[PDB]
Amino acid sequence: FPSDEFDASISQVNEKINQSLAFIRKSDELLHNVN
Amino acid sequence: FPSDEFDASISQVNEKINQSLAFIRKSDELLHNVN
Amino acid sequence: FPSDEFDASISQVNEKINQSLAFIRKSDELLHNVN
Amino acid sequence: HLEGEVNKIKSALLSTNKAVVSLSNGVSVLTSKVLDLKNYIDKQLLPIV
Amino acid sequence: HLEGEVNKIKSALLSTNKAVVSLSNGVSVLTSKVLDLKNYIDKQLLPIV
Amino acid sequence: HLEGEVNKIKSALLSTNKAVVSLSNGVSVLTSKVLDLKNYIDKQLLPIV
Numbered sequence: 001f002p003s004d005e006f007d008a009s010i011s012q013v014n015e016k017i018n019q020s021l022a023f024i025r026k027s028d029e030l031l032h033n034v035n
Numbered sequence: 036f037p038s039d040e041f042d043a044s045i046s047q048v049n050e051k052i053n054q055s056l057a058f059i060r061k062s063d064e065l066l067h068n069v070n
Numbered sequence: 071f072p073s074d075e076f077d078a079s080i081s082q083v084n085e086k087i088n089q090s091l092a093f094i095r096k097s098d099e100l101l102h103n104v105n
Numbered sequence: 106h107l108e109g110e111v112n113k114i115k116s117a118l119l120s121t122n123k124a125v126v127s128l129s130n131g132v133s134v135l136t137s138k139v140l141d142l143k144n145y146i147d148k149q150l151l152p153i154v
Numbered sequence: 155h156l157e158g159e160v161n162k163i164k165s166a167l168l169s170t171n172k173a174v175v176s177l178s179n180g181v182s183v184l185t186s187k188v189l190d191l192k193n194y195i196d197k198q199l200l201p202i203v
Numbered sequence: 204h205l206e207g208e209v210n211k212i213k214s215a216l217l218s219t220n221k222a223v224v225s226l227s228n229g230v231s232v233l234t235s236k237v238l239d240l241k242n243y244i245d246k247q248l249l250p251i252v
């Protein structure tokens with residue numbers, strides 16, 4: 001893996017999930033700094 | 036259903052969707068209390 | 071496409087993704103109006 | 106003015122929440138279709154193969 | 155009162171963020187299952203077909 | 204101080220919104236791949252089976 005373009009697209013989905021989680025981390029960090 | 040581990044994983048996706056919707060419900064309820 | 075109910079469901083997923091992006095657009099537009 | 110701002114943010118978050126509901130509903134439909142594909146393979150394809 | 159409101163919004167957004175994490179985790183599992191289906195077709199179905 | 208807080212929340216929600224866009228784009232790619240799998244089964248597998 002990845003053996004072909006289908007597997008490469010699956011990898012891209014995983015990269016977008018990781019980007020999502022990263023943006024949530026940043027949002028959470030900003031909020032834990034709010035009082 | 037579930038007949039195997041593939042079906043059990045599908046059930047897990049459905050549980051995560053329901054968790055998502057639950058967290059949105061809570062957020063909505065907090066906001067409808069804002070003025 | 072769509073050739074059948076499976077393809078019609080796929081189209082529905084795409085419509086829900088577009089609805090999601092539309093609601094984010096609206097949220098972004100409201101925030102870019104915040105100071 | 107500031108309560109106006111706070112209100113824009115409440116409205117914005119209500120819209121973001123609708124985005125997440127919409128996406129969740131799309132993922133639910135997609136999940137159903139993946140399960141349908143798996144069952145089609147096991148119960149339509151494999152028995153004639 | 156207003157800081158109370160601001161606080162409700164912070165709490166709300168923390169909950170929205172948990173929603174997005176939950177949905178992301180569900181999409182990650184679903185993605186794995188789609189890859190499994192593709193590999194099953196190529197490595198279990200096609201060789202006996 | 205409080206406008207500072209309000210500003211942190213605006214920034215946070217802008218980041219949450221980027222999360223939802225990213226996840227939506229991943230679900231769009233995944234959806235395309237599920238449709239590709241369905242078409243492969245019907246148009247590559249079934250005709251040789």
Ligand SMILES: Cc1ccc(CCCO)c(NCc2ccc3nc(NCCCN4CCOCC4)n(Cc4nc(C)ccc4O)c3c2)c1
Pocket residue numbers: 073074075076141142144145148149241245246
């Ligand atoms: C025993 C059992 C278990 C599970 C299922 C899948 C869910 C119910 O359809 C079935 N389906 C039977 C079943 C029987 C006839 C079907 N006909 C269709 N679609 C119409 C034909 C589409 N054309 C488009 C052009 O290329 C050739 C195929 N589908 C839709 C379809 N649906 C899926 C999921 C995959 C491929 C697919 O073409 C059928 C499903 C049967």
Ligand SMILES: Cc1ccc(CCCO)c(NCc2ccc3nc(NCCCN4CCOCC4)n(Cc4nc(C)ccc4O)c3c2)c1
Pocket residue numbers: 038039040041143147148190191193194197198
């Ligand atoms: C070489 C290779 C590569 C990839 C895979 C898929 C991931 C690992 O299972 C496999 N799986 C072998 C493999 C071998 C025996 C298996 N048995 C099952 N499930 C139990 C049977 C389920 N029943 C339910 C009723 O209708 C008939 C099928 N699965 C689960 C399953 N899993 C998928 C993804 C699709 C269909 C499917 O039934 C198997 C997978 C093998």
Ligand SMILES: Cc1ccc(CCCO)c(NCc2ccc3nc(NCCCN4CCOCC4)n(Cc4nc(C)ccc4O)c3c2)c1
Pocket residue numbers: 003004005006192196197239240242243246247
């Ligand atoms: C008529 C018709 C309609 C739809 C499709 C699918 C989308 C376009 O590829 C096709 N594809 C033809 C087509 C022809 C040759 C192909 N070769 C590959 N991949 C390279 C081989 C991968 N190896 C990895 C190891 O185990 C054996 C398979 N794919 C990628 C691939 N893609 C999918 C979706 C499923 C399985 C799969 O291996 C092909 C798709 C054809």
